[PDB]
Amino acid sequence: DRLFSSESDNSLYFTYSGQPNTLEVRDLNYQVLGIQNLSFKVRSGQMLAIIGSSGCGRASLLDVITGRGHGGKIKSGQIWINGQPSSPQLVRKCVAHVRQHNQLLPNLTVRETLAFIAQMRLPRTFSQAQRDKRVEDVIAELRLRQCADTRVGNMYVRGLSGGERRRVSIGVQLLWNPGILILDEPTSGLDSFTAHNLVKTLSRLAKGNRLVLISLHQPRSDIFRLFDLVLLMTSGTPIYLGAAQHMVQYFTAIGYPCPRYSNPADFYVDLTSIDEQELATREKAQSLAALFLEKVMPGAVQQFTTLIRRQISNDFRDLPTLLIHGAEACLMSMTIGFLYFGHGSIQLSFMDTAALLFMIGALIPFNVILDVISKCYSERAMLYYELEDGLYTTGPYFFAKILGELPEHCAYIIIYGMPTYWLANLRPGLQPFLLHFLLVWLVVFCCRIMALAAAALLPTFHMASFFSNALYNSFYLAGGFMINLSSLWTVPAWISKVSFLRWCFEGLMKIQFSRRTYGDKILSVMELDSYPLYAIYLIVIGLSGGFMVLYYVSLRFIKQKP
């Protein structure tokens, strides 16, 4: 204990003011490892560390206590929180959960994200001064004052250290002043001294009239020495429950002494670890299990504003992504312009202009789908965790994402459409150019919304990408340039009727070839004269609205599991 940093401050700057919270589990029996007759009772001011087999497959024990879980759900016991039966509302109102994987935006500083979480957590009755005071108290409690201005960037970004990231996550989950704190593997992937400091900080937090639960698979000696209460779990059944310093004396009193120069936790874990040998080691754990038993606000508009502000602050600071996007857009524009270069002695023909318009309409959706799927799956887990925490009810989040992605989409459309209409020497004027720009913008927006819906509808990144590519190919073949838009019997015709690429091609044709032929005969011989321009615009708007409705329904009903 003398080898670690000791020049710290043992003061408590942000304590829990209120009635002490309790947590009592009575004969918990989980089914699909095999928790059998779990029972414990902790109060505010104690730090319970669950060592050993603290998991039941894909979900840990703390996920079962909170009511979550990816595996089975059939319970056989009771869970009492603050003297009340377990319920999702109660665990959402009183219990706080700190997952193992952090969910923090890299382009934001500590103070900015803390203020955002405080504004989304504290009610509308608290003034700005109270929110600032709460943020300052949370910063001072976790000793994050020397890094309150530095960014919290993840890997491949400078940001800050891992321990500081864990502290920022704890502060985010602690801004609304919870009564019960729950962390899953807080010292995973951290240094020894960093893990010791984090354990000391968690103990100081638990000392301030709070209840902190910690799950640790293989705790070190210095970490086990700082435990207040410990719970040994081997293959779902409890072996010991009480003080950590008394575990050795209890095991020695029950006839299992700990050898000198050997960690107690690892020894008592591998002594009863399940391996003809499986049944021999199972009764040993069952004998110790039976021996232990005999001896014992603010609103939707405010949330939308906070979300759109956070998204704008995170997007306008990501210079590499914006640079790659602009480079791709400029490369595509230059290729399209110099390939169909109309200035010179030989002018562009009719079929050349048709192919140029079709390519302008159908080449950007690939990169659009790619970028949108990547951006959505890079924060799907964060969105799921923020939705499960109870900040927003995914209503204003849709409009927030839309209006946060709209500026980047408009800039990308400008960059993709500016060096394209003049290099190809298309119809001169302001009205046709503005109409082409608006049509391209609307079509790319519809494709972006389709990509968002496909990302929110399927949980797998590869499956969502495959579905998006299938839809893109179905809309590409249904265009009025490949299969003549006339050789469609029943299915491809209706696919083209809802194909934004076909409508984009028809609109570009009607814009470029109306009364500018070298007349309406060029569209009369073709099949692009049965819908006026405003009708095409209204159809594109209706398709965009339908895709938005589908995306909203998928966000509201389908869980965005990572």
């Epitope: 020049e7 710290s8 401050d9 043992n10 003061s11 408590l12 304590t15 001072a140 309150a148 201005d149």
Partner: antibody, heavy 114, light 105 residues
Framework: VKLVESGGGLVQPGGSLRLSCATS????????MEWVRQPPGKRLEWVAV??????????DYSASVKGRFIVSRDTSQNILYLQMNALRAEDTAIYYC??????????WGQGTTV | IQMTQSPSSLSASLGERVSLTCRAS??????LSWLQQKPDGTIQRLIY???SLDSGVPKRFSGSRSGSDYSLTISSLESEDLAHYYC?????????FGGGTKLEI
């Protein structure tokens, strides 16, 4: 807020002295209590800290006075006490009574010569 | 964290713009306070967090930051400015003070 220091005088080296810091105008049970000294020819130096009721009235001292100084508080009269032992060797200063250190040293007192 | 304050002494006339510089050895993220010790002995905080001002403090005092150098600017100096100034940090334990600056008219 008002801070009044008292208890300064002439003491022999190795003796004992007790300083008194009177508090008025704020809740004595929710704010910290800090002792800050000032040598006649040096900068300000924090001496000790007495936390509020949320920390069970725990105390802490600097690396130079840890073991010789004892700070306490009386909640009945809202008066801070600092028991100094083995003083006058090099601890002669203009000791002041501060309220908060983590939220900026605000509402200083008058200071007394020890 | 050592707080080096410059200059050690400063003399100006009434109405002049005085600027004191305080440098921190580490990063405090703007957690700096400015104290004013009157010749009588009573100290009074003027600027906290290096940007805000306390209650009852005249609007002539202002705080700025240029990189890692915090600056306390006093415009329209009057006769009530003859005192000592100490910059301190409270972002890292323990709380350290500055060398000090004796401002004389």
């Amino acid at each position: 807020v008002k801070l009044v220091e008292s208890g300064g005088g002439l003491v022999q080296p190795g003796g004992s002295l007790r300083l008194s810091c009177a508090t008025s105008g704020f809740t004595f049970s929710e704010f910290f209590m800090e002792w800050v000294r000032q040598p006649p020819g040096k900068r300000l130096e924090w001496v000790a800290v007495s936390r509020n009721e949320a920390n069970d009235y725990t105390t802490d001292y600097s690396a130079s006075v840890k073991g010789r100084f004892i700070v306490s508080r009386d909640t009945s009269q809202n008066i801070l006490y600092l028991q100094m032992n083995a003083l006058r060797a090099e601890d002669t200063a203009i000791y002041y009574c501060a309220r908060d250190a983590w939220m900026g040293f605000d509402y200083w007192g008058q200071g007394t010569t020890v | 964290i050592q707080m080096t304050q410059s200059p050690s002494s400063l003399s100006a006339s009434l109405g002049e713009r005085v600027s004191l510089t305080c440098r921190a050895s580490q990063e405090i993220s703007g957690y700096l306070s400015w104290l004013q010790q009157k010749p009588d002995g009573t100290i009074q905080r003027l600027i906290y967090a290096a940007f805000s001002l306390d209650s009852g403090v005249p609007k002539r005092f202002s705080g700025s930051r240029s990189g890692s150098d915090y600056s306390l600017t006093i415009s329209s100096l009057e006769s009530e400015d003859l005192a000592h100034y100490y910059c301190l940090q409270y972002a890292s334990y323990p709380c350290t003070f500055g060398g000090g600056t004796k401002l004389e008219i």
